Design a protein around this nucleic acid. Structure first.
Lengths: 403, 87
RNA sequence: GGCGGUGGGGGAGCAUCUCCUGUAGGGGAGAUGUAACCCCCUUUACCUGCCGAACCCCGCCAGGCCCGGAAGGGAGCAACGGUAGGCAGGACGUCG
């Protein structure tokens, strides 16, 4: 959960730069990147593959090939680790008009009755009017821990403490709260500790509504077992199912739980964090890892990885390319040091530049003293060597011009 | 030991390297100033006009090395006191 | 349509000071101040998107630089991510 992010980043850590990988140093990370995962109760078999797709990737076709050394493997791990926690499908649809119908379910001992309230205060902010309907029995405390909530919010709810039932104590509220209902969540999950029974009560009530989404409120704590629940759910819900895994703070195992729900194709659209409606963001893989691996997340590689293709497309991209530009020259030194301005003069120009701002490279007249001295100080060279780059530039630019 | 100008620069700040308090913190410390001080104190120092303190890696500030086996902190205090009183 | 974006508490961290310390880089311990990370309480003051001040704003620090014989450590610029702050929509609050 947090120890995973704890014992884990201790491997990306290992990757510094000192003694550039021979071709095995990667392994000294893998065995442990993985054990963080196993220890974080992830289905072993999932882990052993995870470990192989780094082999056949980063001690094979590897090569700084891309964003340089350590950066890469520290990238491969990521881009893959993520795919474990989920491909991507968090797009919780909303309401094509002004009326939808989400169905909540999930074995007893979960956060199902609460996750009700929470979701209500998700859509609230999404920009919609959600109402809840206690479509099952509740314990004489459950009323002291729900309504209150629906009161913490504007969410109206139809609860039955007098006489009770199901397929009508659900009909009325349906044909009742509509006078403002943009979205309607229905808390129906009977008190079942076992899935089969969960999926039967759930249907009697899928014939009375035409659900837009059925949601399964699983449970982190439940660790990898969460996924054998995900299957019986997907294998019974016409793909309108979506998991909600909560209690991601109450357990060492749990991150190992999403990976389970992640094997099953069934989509994960929300996650638990705590108890207060605040800490309850939608689930999006990449983000979860940013929180996880700490350090510099995903987008941190779309300028120094996007500007680098086969070099026969880039080396020649600039063949038609004529008009100058500082990122365009950077793009030329990046074909002079390589693919053969003395050496040392080629890396230093590329070094100085590599410390300017897009704004400064894009149409670079705005550069003067105060800035020069910051590029020239952030890069390790002298104010004079940055002026030589400017010079060089301002010369190649005058020169490069017509056809 | 090494003595970096920055230890005793009334202008620089603590994080930027100062070690003596505001009182003793000469304005514009020079190596001369430094060298000289340790001389009066019976030490035998050498200047390296061209070294740099990582904290201001971009500036050749130089340091002076002395072989002394005592507290550095109070040598430093020792050097500043001598410098504030200078004809 | 208009108009509006709330108070705080805890600790990490950061800035400035003070004290001890190691024959470099450094290391310990505190006071004060805080927006930035974590978590809670209050509130309509929150959402999604794009921007954000180059640097004397935070993190993160690739390279490059510095101290070191190395191990390692420093400062820190782009990028990236954020604050303060803005442009949109949307929803909440108001209409004084």
């Amino acid at each position: 959960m947090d120890k995973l992010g704890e014992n884990l980043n201790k491997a990306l850590n290992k990757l510094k730069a000192a003694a550039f990988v021979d071709k095995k140093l990667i392994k000294e990370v893998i065995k442990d990147i993985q054990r963080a995962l196993i220890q974080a109760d992830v289905n072993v078999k999932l882990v052993l593959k995870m470990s192989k797709e780094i082999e056949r990737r980063a001690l094979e076709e590897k090569t700084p090939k891309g964003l340089s050394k350590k950066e890469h493997i520290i990238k491969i791990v990521y881009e893959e680790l993520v795919k474990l926690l989920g491909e991507e499908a968090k797009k919780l649809e909303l309401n094509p008009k002004k009326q939808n119908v989400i169905l909540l379910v999930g074995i007893q001992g979960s956060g199902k009755t609460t996750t009700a309230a929470k979701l209500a205060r998700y859509i609230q902010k999404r920009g919609l009017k959600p109402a809840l309907i206690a479509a099952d029995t509740y314990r004489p405390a459950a009323y002291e821990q729900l309504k209150q909530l629906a009161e913490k919010i504007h969410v109206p709810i139809y609860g039955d403490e007098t006489r009770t039932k199901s397929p009508v104590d659900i009909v009325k509220e349906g044909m009742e709260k509509f006078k403002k209902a943009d979205v309607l969540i229905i808390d129906t999950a009977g008190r079942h500790k076992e899935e089969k029974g969960l999926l039967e009560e759930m249907k009697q009530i899928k014939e009375i509504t035409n659900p837009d989404e059925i949601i399964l409120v699983i449970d982190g704590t439940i660790g990898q077992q969460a996924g054998i629940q995900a299957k019986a759910f997907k294998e019974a819900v016409g793909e309108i199912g979506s998991i909600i895994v909560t209690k991601l703070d109450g357990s060492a195992k749990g991150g190992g739980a999403l990976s389970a729900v992640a094997e099953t194709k069934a989509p994960i659209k929300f996650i638990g964090i705590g108890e207060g409606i605040d800490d309850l963001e939608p689930f999006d893989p990449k983000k979860f890892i940013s929180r996880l691996l700490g350090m510099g997340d995903l987008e941190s590689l779309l300028e120094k990885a996007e500007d680098m293709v086969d070099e026969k497309t880039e080396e020649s991209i600039d063949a038609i390319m004529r008009g100058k530009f500082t990122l365009n020259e950077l793009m030329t030194q990046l074909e002079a040091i390589e693919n053969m301005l003395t050496e040392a003069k080629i890396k230093k120009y590329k070094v100085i530049i590599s410390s300017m701002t897009k704004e400064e490279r894009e149409n670079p007249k705005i550069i003067k003293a105060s800035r020069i001295r910051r590029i020239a100080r952030g890069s390790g060279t002298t104010e004079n060597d940055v002026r030589e780059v400017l010079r060089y530039y301002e010369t190649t630019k005058n020169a490069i011009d017509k056809l | 030991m090494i003595i970096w100008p920055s230890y005793i620069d009334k202008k620089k700040s603590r994080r930027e390297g100062r070690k003596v308090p505001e009182e003793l913190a000469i304005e514009k410390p020079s190596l001369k100033d430094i060298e000289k001080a340790l001389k009066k104190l019976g030490l035998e120092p050498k200047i390296y006009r061209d070294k740099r303190y990582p904290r201001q890696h971009w500036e050749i500030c130089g340091c002076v090395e002395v072989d002394y086996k005592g507290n550095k902190l109070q040598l430093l205090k020792e050097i500043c006191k001598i410098i504030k009183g200078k004809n």
